[PDB]
């Protein structure tokens, strides 16, 4: 009767049908049985990584006993679930806990083996002392109490294997994680338990996707557990959608009910610079109130003539998680991908050969054609200076994230000595900086969709190349802590400045003599950039002037530029040895200097608009 | 239990996932029938723990296969080369050497206190000398991901 106070009844719980169906894993359960039914030392311990199913095996054995598939040596035996936490509850006096545990042990021995104690998280059996969890050591080695335990793989060697007198009384059972084909079956069996809790239906083509998809995207966790979450979340989200309106009709309404209040409390601003903001916000409101009322119409076109989860809700879940977009190109993204070297051309000018290669390994990955285990694209573009090869790697990180500072840049010119490698991989255990991990590593392990940029790579020491050697071609590198980080979704970009003027084989042979063939072989196309012709500078001129104008709008201060000045600047863009950097200095020598002189000398105030005009030699405002 | 509930899927995608479940279910029904029949031959025409049940326990524990080559593995061990050749091509002078060190330990002939065989590949770039190790680690465990690999 002391076993009623400190434990529940697993077999009784399994009798009333309160446990999930256990599928497969025949070998593990048969070994648990043939260990649990020997003369002495008859107590197994399941062992293995967290999530692969180790309480599932004990619950399967309990259901199996209740049914009657077990041998004669185990027919009609009850399994009790010991609870070490509720025993040390009130034991402040000097012997009460030992008294409790002794009563429990005596009561277990008082039966004739009709009880199988099952301790979960048994690594907690070492403490309870303050000579505790130690009075069990005699009864263990004789086979009185049949113990079924299950702890993860690495708290075993941390709490138990330290005590080789106690770990002798345990027989280990290793529980390896299943494969995709087996996880599919486990899900096929468990589906009808979520189909009830959520009032929905789940499609087998979705049960296959929730297991194939969650095997190449979520690598930090193990099997089935990392494949049941997708199904459960998809169902819960679908039920939410069923009750209320669908998504993308809810957020459009939430933000509209906010822009209203914004413009309402903004229109009462007795101000003049705030009138250009109100007249700009008042347009996005009418633009949103357009597609909102279009969605409410397109929803009735379907509601007059999305009721079970498919292989699409799963992808949407594994995309909201982990940030990686793996969807189906829902007709809004494809129209944007189709004109990409057109949205990149607003920031980079020329280099058509290189824009149509960076942009070419994004489509052939969003359409599901690239190798699923290798980086999305790994190519190095190199050429003369000031040509636009560090700008392209920023016009690209802005097309995908809408923020130029959401990417990972490391300036490879500080890696002059080989010992500077530990800066991006961590320091081995037992050294100064170890509870910090790597620096490149920990940056990608948190958001595995960024675009890495190794700037000025040939200035480094030829060992960091050999570190990168396996990043390309496999997308993996492990830090000090032993955590493997995957790169199979990033875009690897390496700039350079080799050759410096050689036509095509003074540079192609200077790359070959600075890098090794095993490093050139992992790369995709080696893009060559080209100098700037006189025509393709008259356009960078416009870009620069637009930039400066946008920078000036902090004072509502514009400026008018005449075509003579616009083609004077571009003709004073000179020296096809320095690219397009001199022009940014010419602009500030000509316009910016005298504008700033006039600006703090009175005689120019906000709201004005200054026209530039080419004096016979210089520019006059 | 799978196939009698998968058939009622109002879809076409799974219609090819059902055209194999039936096949394997039948191909296993055949084997069960054959073996249950052989049981009758043995019952008409064991009762002690022999020497190899201990070996079976040593294999269930510790995962190491130390058994008696039950006549189905010895076919794989002779088709090893032609089964690797389904993933690597050429380099037969290396395939023969990798494979020979596995039968040499299944027959219990290699030295018992030394690795099961340890040798180094070397040659020009992109030839196969890393695909072969992954093809060998898959022929033995049936999952390419289950090898301890460290990048030196
Ligand atoms: N063979 C299986 N059949 C059915 N469901 C399973 C199976 N293996 C695991 N599951 C389910 O997958 C999840 C695994 O959870 P548990 O196995 O209880 O946790 P665990 O494997 O013990 O990991 P720890 O060490 O306890 S944190 C549960 O939802 C189980 O119902
Ligand atoms: N084709 C181009 N289109 C637009 N701006 C360009 C172009 N080429 C250079 N620029 C300008 O030049 C600056 C950036 O030049 P970068 O390409 O970053 O220099 P770089 O090409 O990396 O050469 P190095 O070797 O790194 S100094 C920015 O101010 C850009 O506006
Ligand atoms: N004999 C081969 N049979 C099949 N695929 C091959 C063969 N040789 C190379 N490959 C392909 O080459 C890639 C693997 O090359 P690896 O052999 O791994 O390179 P490597 O041998 O490691 O050389 P390095 O110096 O290490 S880069 C895969 O895409 C394979 O398909």
Short mmCIF file of N, CA and C in Angstrom, two decimals, chain A residues 93-243:
data_model
loop_
_atom_site.label_atom_id
_atom_site.label_comp_id
_atom_site.label_asym_id
_atom_site.label_seq_id
_atom_site.Cartn_x
_atom_site.Cartn_y
_atom_site.Cartn_z
N UNK A 93 13.54 15.56 8.16
CA UNK A 93 14.10 14.90 9.32
C UNK A 93 15.13 13.86 8.89
N UNK A 94 15.92 13.40 9.86
CA UNK A 94 17.19 12.75 9.57
C UNK A 94 17.05 11.33 9.03
N UNK A 95 15.85 10.77 8.94
CA UNK A 95 15.76 9.43 8.41
C UNK A 95 14.53 9.11 7.60
N UNK A 96 13.70 10.12 7.34
CA UNK A 96 12.38 9.84 6.78
C UNK A 96 12.46 9.34 5.35
N UNK A 97 13.37 9.89 4.55
CA UNK A 97 13.47 9.43 3.17
C UNK A 97 13.94 7.99 3.11
N UNK A 98 14.95 7.63 3.91
CA UNK A 98 15.39 6.25 3.94
C UNK A 98 14.27 5.33 4.40
N UNK A 99 13.48 5.77 5.38
CA UNK A 99 12.34 4.96 5.81
C UNK A 99 11.37 4.73 4.66
N UNK A 100 11.04 5.79 3.92
CA UNK A 100 10.12 5.64 2.80
C UNK A 100 10.66 4.66 1.78
N UNK A 101 11.91 4.84 1.36
CA UNK A 101 12.46 3.98 0.32
C UNK A 101 12.56 2.54 0.80
N UNK A 102 12.81 2.35 2.09
CA UNK A 102 12.90 0.99 2.61
C UNK A 102 11.53 0.33 2.62
N UNK A 103 10.49 1.07 2.99
CA UNK A 103 9.14 0.51 2.89
C UNK A 103 8.82 0.12 1.46
N UNK A 104 9.17 0.98 0.50
CA UNK A 104 8.89 0.69 -0.90
C UNK A 104 9.62 -0.56 -1.35
N UNK A 105 10.90 -0.68 -1.00
CA UNK A 105 11.66 -1.84 -1.42
C UNK A 105 11.13 -3.12 -0.78
N UNK A 106 10.81 -3.05 0.51
CA UNK A 106 10.26 -4.22 1.19
C UNK A 106 8.95 -4.64 0.55
N UNK A 107 8.13 -3.67 0.16
CA UNK A 107 6.84 -4.02 -0.44
C UNK A 107 7.02 -4.61 -1.83
N UNK A 108 8.02 -4.14 -2.58
CA UNK A 108 8.29 -4.74 -3.88
C UNK A 108 8.75 -6.18 -3.72
N UNK A 109 9.64 -6.42 -2.75
CA UNK A 109 10.12 -7.78 -2.54
C UNK A 109 9.03 -8.67 -1.95
N UNK A 110 8.06 -8.07 -1.27
CA UNK A 110 7.02 -8.86 -0.61
C UNK A 110 6.14 -9.58 -1.62
N UNK A 111 6.00 -9.03 -2.82
CA UNK A 111 5.34 -9.75 -3.90
C UNK A 111 6.33 -10.74 -4.49
N UNK A 112 5.86 -11.61 -5.38
CA UNK A 112 6.67 -12.69 -5.91
C UNK A 112 7.13 -12.40 -7.33
N UNK A 113 7.45 -11.14 -7.62
CA UNK A 113 7.83 -10.78 -8.96
C UNK A 113 6.66 -10.43 -9.85
N UNK A 114 5.52 -10.06 -9.27
CA UNK A 114 4.37 -9.60 -10.03
C UNK A 114 4.42 -8.10 -10.29
N UNK A 115 5.57 -7.47 -10.06
CA UNK A 115 5.73 -6.03 -10.25
C UNK A 115 7.03 -5.79 -10.99
N UNK A 116 7.01 -4.86 -11.93
CA UNK A 116 8.19 -4.47 -12.69
C UNK A 116 8.36 -2.97 -12.55
N UNK A 117 9.19 -2.54 -11.61
CA UNK A 117 9.42 -1.12 -11.41
C UNK A 117 10.09 -0.52 -12.64
N UNK A 118 9.61 0.65 -13.04
CA UNK A 118 10.07 1.34 -14.25
C UNK A 118 10.42 2.77 -13.85
N UNK A 119 11.71 3.07 -13.80
CA UNK A 119 12.18 4.40 -13.43
C UNK A 119 12.57 5.15 -14.69
N UNK A 120 11.93 6.29 -14.92
CA UNK A 120 12.24 7.15 -16.05
C UNK A 120 13.20 8.23 -15.60
N UNK A 121 14.12 8.62 -16.48
CA UNK A 121 15.19 9.55 -16.15
C UNK A 121 15.96 9.04 -14.94
N UNK A 122 16.52 7.84 -15.08
CA UNK A 122 17.11 7.22 -13.90
C UNK A 122 18.45 7.82 -13.54
N UNK A 123 19.00 8.71 -14.35
CA UNK A 123 20.21 9.40 -13.94
C UNK A 123 19.99 10.23 -12.69
N UNK A 124 18.74 10.49 -12.32
CA UNK A 124 18.43 11.17 -11.08
C UNK A 124 18.47 10.24 -9.88
N UNK A 125 18.84 8.98 -10.06
CA UNK A 125 18.88 8.05 -8.94
C UNK A 125 20.17 8.15 -8.15
N UNK A 126 21.14 8.93 -8.63
CA UNK A 126 22.43 9.01 -7.95
C UNK A 126 22.33 9.85 -6.68
N UNK A 127 21.51 10.89 -6.71
CA UNK A 127 21.42 11.75 -5.55
C UNK A 127 20.42 11.27 -4.53
N UNK A 128 19.50 12.16 -4.14
CA UNK A 128 18.47 11.90 -3.14
C UNK A 128 19.05 11.76 -1.74
N UNK A 129 20.35 11.99 -1.60
CA UNK A 129 21.02 11.78 -0.33
C UNK A 129 20.98 12.95 0.61
N UNK A 130 21.53 14.08 0.20
CA UNK A 130 21.59 15.27 1.03
C UNK A 130 22.12 16.46 0.23
N UNK A 131 24.88 8.13 0.42
CA UNK A 131 24.03 7.21 1.15
C UNK A 131 22.56 7.39 0.78
N UNK A 132 22.25 7.26 -0.51
CA UNK A 132 20.88 7.19 -0.99
C UNK A 132 20.92 6.79 -2.45
N UNK A 133 19.85 6.15 -2.92
CA UNK A 133 19.95 5.43 -4.17
C UNK A 133 21.09 4.44 -4.16
N UNK A 134 21.43 3.93 -2.99
CA UNK A 134 22.59 3.08 -2.77
C UNK A 134 22.14 1.83 -2.02
N UNK A 135 21.12 1.98 -1.18
CA UNK A 135 20.51 0.82 -0.56
C UNK A 135 19.79 -0.07 -1.56
N UNK A 136 19.62 0.40 -2.80
CA UNK A 136 19.06 -0.41 -3.87
C UNK A 136 20.08 -1.36 -4.47
N UNK A 137 21.36 -1.12 -4.23
CA UNK A 137 22.44 -1.85 -4.87
C UNK A 137 22.45 -3.33 -4.49
N UNK A 138 22.12 -3.71 -3.25
CA UNK A 138 22.01 -5.15 -2.98
C UNK A 138 20.88 -5.81 -3.75
N UNK A 139 19.66 -5.31 -3.61
CA UNK A 139 18.52 -5.93 -4.27
C UNK A 139 18.63 -5.93 -5.78
N UNK A 140 19.41 -5.01 -6.36
CA UNK A 140 19.59 -5.03 -7.80
C UNK A 140 20.29 -6.30 -8.25
N UNK A 141 21.48 -6.56 -7.71
CA UNK A 141 22.34 -7.62 -8.19
C UNK A 141 21.76 -9.01 -8.00
N UNK A 142 20.66 -9.15 -7.27
CA UNK A 142 20.04 -10.44 -7.05
C UNK A 142 18.82 -10.67 -7.93
N UNK A 143 18.29 -9.63 -8.55
CA UNK A 143 17.16 -9.77 -9.43
C UNK A 143 15.81 -9.68 -8.76
N UNK A 144 15.74 -9.10 -7.56
CA UNK A 144 14.46 -8.96 -6.89
C UNK A 144 13.55 -7.98 -7.61
N UNK A 145 14.01 -6.74 -7.77
CA UNK A 145 13.25 -5.71 -8.46
C UNK A 145 13.70 -5.65 -9.91
N UNK A 146 12.75 -5.81 -10.82
CA UNK A 146 13.03 -5.72 -12.24
C UNK A 146 12.94 -4.26 -12.67
N UNK A 147 14.08 -3.69 -13.05
CA UNK A 147 14.18 -2.26 -13.31
C UNK A 147 14.26 -2.03 -14.81
N UNK A 148 13.38 -1.19 -15.33
CA UNK A 148 13.44 -0.76 -16.71
C UNK A 148 13.70 0.74 -16.70
N UNK A 149 14.87 1.14 -17.18
CA UNK A 149 15.25 2.53 -17.17
C UNK A 149 15.55 3.03 -18.58
N UNK A 150 15.55 4.35 -18.71
CA UNK A 150 15.79 4.96 -20.02
C UNK A 150 16.30 6.38 -19.79
N UNK A 151 17.58 6.60 -20.08
CA UNK A 151 18.19 7.92 -20.04
C UNK A 151 18.87 8.19 -21.37
N UNK A 152 19.10 9.46 -21.66
CA UNK A 152 19.72 9.79 -22.93
C UNK A 152 21.17 9.31 -22.94
N UNK A 153 21.81 9.47 -24.08
CA UNK A 153 23.10 8.85 -24.30
C UNK A 153 24.21 9.49 -23.49
N UNK A 154 24.14 10.80 -23.23
CA UNK A 154 25.29 11.54 -22.72
C UNK A 154 25.13 11.97 -21.27
N UNK A 155 23.96 11.78 -20.66
CA UNK A 155 23.90 11.90 -19.21
C UNK A 155 24.20 10.58 -18.54
N UNK A 156 24.12 9.48 -19.28
CA UNK A 156 24.65 8.21 -18.81
C UNK A 156 26.11 8.35 -18.43
N UNK A 157 26.97 8.65 -19.41
CA UNK A 157 28.40 8.73 -19.13
C UNK A 157 28.75 9.91 -18.24
N UNK A 158 27.78 10.71 -17.84
CA UNK A 158 28.04 11.83 -16.96
C UNK A 158 27.65 11.57 -15.52
N UNK A 159 26.61 10.78 -15.28
CA UNK A 159 26.21 10.50 -13.91
C UNK A 159 26.38 9.05 -13.50
N UNK A 160 26.22 8.10 -14.41
CA UNK A 160 26.23 6.68 -14.08
C UNK A 160 27.61 6.08 -14.25
N UNK A 161 28.18 6.16 -15.46
CA UNK A 161 29.47 5.54 -15.72
C UNK A 161 30.57 6.03 -14.79
N UNK A 162 30.33 7.09 -14.04
CA UNK A 162 31.23 7.56 -13.01
C UNK A 162 31.23 6.66 -11.78
N UNK A 163 30.35 5.67 -11.73
CA UNK A 163 30.07 4.88 -10.54
C UNK A 163 30.07 3.39 -10.87
N UNK A 164 31.16 2.92 -11.48
CA UNK A 164 31.22 1.58 -12.07
C UNK A 164 30.75 0.47 -11.14
N UNK A 165 30.58 0.75 -9.85
CA UNK A 165 29.97 -0.25 -8.97
C UNK A 165 28.47 -0.38 -9.22
N UNK A 166 27.81 0.68 -9.67
CA UNK A 166 26.37 0.65 -9.90
C UNK A 166 26.02 0.38 -11.35
N UNK A 167 26.81 0.87 -12.29
CA UNK A 167 26.53 0.59 -13.69
C UNK A 167 26.85 -0.85 -14.07
N UNK A 168 27.38 -1.64 -13.14
CA UNK A 168 27.56 -3.06 -13.42
C UNK A 168 26.24 -3.80 -13.41
N UNK A 169 25.27 -3.32 -12.63
CA UNK A 169 23.99 -4.00 -12.48
C UNK A 169 23.01 -3.67 -13.59
N UNK A 170 23.47 -3.11 -14.70
CA UNK A 170 22.58 -2.71 -15.78
C UNK A 170 23.07 -3.30 -17.09
N UNK A 171 22.12 -3.75 -17.91
CA UNK A 171 22.40 -4.26 -19.25
C UNK A 171 21.94 -3.22 -20.25
N UNK A 172 22.86 -2.71 -21.06
CA UNK A 172 22.53 -1.61 -21.95
C UNK A 172 21.79 -2.10 -23.18
N UNK A 173 20.82 -1.31 -23.63
CA UNK A 173 20.12 -1.56 -24.87
C UNK A 173 20.20 -0.28 -25.69
N UNK A 174 20.85 -0.35 -26.84
CA UNK A 174 21.04 0.81 -27.69
C UNK A 174 19.84 0.97 -28.61
N UNK A 175 19.35 2.19 -28.75
CA UNK A 175 18.16 2.48 -29.52
C UNK A 175 18.55 3.47 -30.61
N UNK A 176 18.88 2.96 -31.79
CA UNK A 176 19.23 3.82 -32.89
C UNK A 176 18.02 4.45 -33.54
N UNK A 177 18.24 5.59 -34.19
CA UNK A 177 17.11 6.32 -34.74
C UNK A 177 16.64 5.64 -36.03
N UNK A 178 15.35 5.74 -36.35
CA UNK A 178 14.84 5.06 -37.54
C UNK A 178 15.24 5.80 -38.80
N UNK A 179 14.78 5.28 -39.93
CA UNK A 179 15.02 5.90 -41.21
C UNK A 179 13.74 6.55 -41.73
N UNK A 180 13.81 7.05 -42.96
CA UNK A 180 12.67 7.74 -43.55
C UNK A 180 11.54 6.76 -43.82
N UNK A 181 11.86 5.59 -44.38
CA UNK A 181 10.83 4.60 -44.68
C UNK A 181 10.09 4.15 -43.43
N UNK A 182 10.79 4.03 -42.31
CA UNK A 182 10.14 3.64 -41.07
C UNK A 182 9.36 4.77 -40.44
N UNK A 183 9.89 5.99 -40.50
CA UNK A 183 9.17 7.13 -39.96
C UNK A 183 7.85 7.33 -40.68
N UNK A 184 7.84 7.07 -41.99
CA UNK A 184 6.60 7.15 -42.75
C UNK A 184 5.56 6.22 -42.16
N UNK A 185 5.95 4.98 -41.84
CA UNK A 185 5.00 4.04 -41.27
C UNK A 185 4.52 4.47 -39.89
N UNK A 186 5.45 4.96 -39.07
CA UNK A 186 5.06 5.42 -37.74
C UNK A 186 4.03 6.53 -37.85
N UNK A 187 4.21 7.43 -38.81
CA UNK A 187 3.23 8.50 -38.99
C UNK A 187 1.91 7.94 -39.52
N UNK A 188 1.98 6.99 -40.45
CA UNK A 188 0.76 6.38 -40.96
C UNK A 188 -0.05 5.77 -39.84
N UNK A 189 0.62 5.30 -38.80
CA UNK A 189 -0.09 4.75 -37.66
C UNK A 189 -0.59 5.78 -36.68
N UNK A 190 0.15 6.86 -36.49
CA UNK A 190 -0.24 7.86 -35.50
C UNK A 190 -1.21 8.90 -36.03
N UNK A 191 -1.44 8.96 -37.34
CA UNK A 191 -2.26 10.03 -37.91
C UNK A 191 -3.64 10.11 -37.26
N UNK A 192 -4.30 8.97 -37.10
CA UNK A 192 -5.69 8.97 -36.66
C UNK A 192 -5.86 9.36 -35.21
N UNK A 193 -4.79 9.72 -34.51
CA UNK A 193 -4.92 10.25 -33.16
C UNK A 193 -4.92 11.77 -33.15
N UNK A 194 -4.30 12.40 -34.15
CA UNK A 194 -4.41 13.84 -34.34
C UNK A 194 -5.63 14.21 -35.15
N UNK A 195 -6.00 13.36 -36.11
CA UNK A 195 -7.23 13.56 -36.87
C UNK A 195 -8.43 13.78 -35.96
N UNK A 196 -8.38 13.26 -34.74
CA UNK A 196 -9.50 13.44 -33.82
C UNK A 196 -9.33 14.70 -33.01
N UNK A 197 -8.19 14.86 -32.35
CA UNK A 197 -7.98 16.01 -31.47
C UNK A 197 -8.20 17.31 -32.22
N UNK A 198 -7.60 17.46 -33.39
CA UNK A 198 -7.95 18.56 -34.28
C UNK A 198 -9.02 18.04 -35.23
N UNK A 199 -10.12 18.77 -35.35
CA UNK A 199 -11.18 18.29 -36.21
C UNK A 199 -10.84 18.41 -37.68
N UNK A 200 -9.84 17.67 -38.14
CA UNK A 200 -9.37 17.81 -39.52
C UNK A 200 -9.04 16.44 -40.10
N UNK A 201 -8.57 16.44 -41.35
CA UNK A 201 -8.12 15.23 -42.02
C UNK A 201 -6.71 15.46 -42.55
N UNK A 202 -5.90 14.40 -42.57
CA UNK A 202 -4.50 14.48 -42.95
C UNK A 202 -4.25 13.52 -44.11
N UNK A 203 -3.56 14.00 -45.13
CA UNK A 203 -3.39 13.25 -46.37
C UNK A 203 -2.06 12.51 -46.39
N UNK A 204 -2.08 11.28 -46.90
CA UNK A 204 -0.88 10.47 -46.91
C UNK A 204 0.24 11.11 -47.72
N UNK A 205 -0.11 11.83 -48.79
CA UNK A 205 0.91 12.58 -49.50
C UNK A 205 1.52 13.67 -48.64
N UNK A 206 0.83 14.08 -47.58
CA UNK A 206 1.43 14.98 -46.60
C UNK A 206 2.23 14.23 -45.56
N UNK A 207 1.82 13.02 -45.21
CA UNK A 207 2.60 12.24 -44.26
C UNK A 207 3.94 11.84 -44.84
N UNK A 208 4.03 11.69 -46.16
CA UNK A 208 5.33 11.40 -46.75
C UNK A 208 6.20 12.65 -46.80
N UNK A 209 5.58 13.81 -47.04
CA UNK A 209 6.35 15.04 -47.14
C UNK A 209 6.85 15.51 -45.79
N UNK A 210 6.05 15.34 -44.73
CA UNK A 210 6.51 15.76 -43.41
C UNK A 210 7.69 14.95 -42.92
N UNK A 211 8.04 13.87 -43.61
CA UNK A 211 9.20 13.07 -43.23
C UNK A 211 10.35 13.19 -44.21
N UNK A 212 10.08 13.36 -45.50
CA UNK A 212 11.18 13.63 -46.42
C UNK A 212 11.69 15.05 -46.27
N UNK A 213 10.80 16.00 -45.99
CA UNK A 213 11.18 17.40 -45.93
C UNK A 213 11.94 17.70 -44.65
N UNK A 214 11.50 17.13 -43.53
CA UNK A 214 12.13 17.34 -42.24
C UNK A 214 13.37 16.49 -42.06
N UNK A 215 13.95 15.99 -43.14
CA UNK A 215 15.20 15.26 -43.07
C UNK A 215 16.34 15.96 -43.78
N UNK A 216 16.07 17.04 -44.50
CA UNK A 216 17.12 17.83 -45.11
C UNK A 216 17.12 19.27 -44.66
N UNK A 217 16.20 19.67 -43.80
CA UNK A 217 16.13 21.05 -43.32
C UNK A 217 16.40 21.19 -41.84
N UNK A 218 15.84 20.32 -41.01
CA UNK A 218 16.07 20.40 -39.57
C UNK A 218 17.06 19.34 -39.15
N UNK A 219 18.34 19.70 -39.05
CA UNK A 219 19.37 18.73 -38.72
C UNK A 219 19.77 18.76 -37.25
N UNK A 220 19.31 19.74 -36.49
CA UNK A 220 19.68 19.84 -35.09
C UNK A 220 18.95 18.84 -34.21
N UNK A 221 17.88 18.23 -34.70
CA UNK A 221 17.07 17.30 -33.94
C UNK A 221 17.02 15.96 -34.65
N UNK A 222 16.55 14.94 -33.94
CA UNK A 222 16.53 13.59 -34.46
C UNK A 222 15.13 13.22 -34.91
N UNK A 223 14.99 11.98 -35.36
CA UNK A 223 13.81 11.47 -36.05
C UNK A 223 12.66 11.26 -35.07
N UNK A 224 11.68 10.43 -35.37
CA UNK A 224 10.29 10.90 -35.50
C UNK A 224 9.95 12.23 -34.86
N UNK A 225 10.45 12.54 -33.66
CA UNK A 225 10.03 13.76 -33.00
C UNK A 225 10.11 14.99 -33.90
N UNK A 226 11.17 15.13 -34.68
CA UNK A 226 11.27 16.27 -35.58
C UNK A 226 10.40 16.14 -36.82
N UNK A 227 9.57 15.10 -36.89
CA UNK A 227 8.68 14.90 -38.03
C UNK A 227 7.22 14.86 -37.63
N UNK A 228 6.93 14.87 -36.33
CA UNK A 228 5.55 14.86 -35.86
C UNK A 228 5.14 16.29 -35.57
N UNK A 229 6.11 17.13 -35.23
CA UNK A 229 5.80 18.53 -34.98
C UNK A 229 5.21 19.19 -36.22
N UNK A 230 5.74 18.87 -37.39
CA UNK A 230 5.22 19.49 -38.60
C UNK A 230 3.76 19.13 -38.80
N UNK A 231 3.42 17.85 -38.65
CA UNK A 231 2.04 17.42 -38.82
C UNK A 231 1.13 18.10 -37.80
N UNK A 232 1.55 18.12 -36.54
CA UNK A 232 0.71 18.70 -35.50
C UNK A 232 0.51 20.19 -35.71
N UNK A 233 1.58 20.92 -36.03
CA UNK A 233 1.45 22.35 -36.25
C UNK A 233 0.58 22.64 -37.45
N UNK A 234 0.77 21.91 -38.55
CA UNK A 234 -0.06 22.12 -39.72
C UNK A 234 -1.53 21.94 -39.39
N UNK A 235 -1.86 20.88 -38.65
CA UNK A 235 -3.26 20.67 -38.30
C UNK A 235 -3.79 21.79 -37.42
N UNK A 236 -3.02 22.22 -36.42
CA UNK A 236 -3.51 23.28 -35.54
C UNK A 236 -3.74 24.57 -36.30
N UNK A 237 -2.82 24.90 -37.21
CA UNK A 237 -2.99 26.10 -38.02
C UNK A 237 -4.21 25.99 -38.92
N UNK A 238 -4.45 24.81 -39.49
CA UNK A 238 -5.62 24.64 -40.34
C UNK A 238 -6.90 24.81 -39.55
N UNK A 239 -6.92 24.34 -38.31
CA UNK A 239 -8.12 24.54 -37.49
C UNK A 239 -8.32 26.01 -37.17
N UNK A 240 -7.25 26.72 -36.82
CA UNK A 240 -7.35 28.17 -36.66
C UNK A 240 -7.97 28.81 -37.89
N UNK A 241 -7.46 28.46 -39.07
CA UNK A 241 -7.99 29.03 -40.30
C UNK A 241 -9.46 28.68 -40.49
N UNK A 242 -9.85 27.46 -40.12
CA UNK A 242 -11.24 27.05 -40.27
C UNK A 242 -12.16 27.93 -39.44
N UNK A 243 -11.80 28.19 -38.19
CA UNK A 243 -12.67 29.00 -37.35
C UNK A 243 -12.80 30.43 -37.88
#
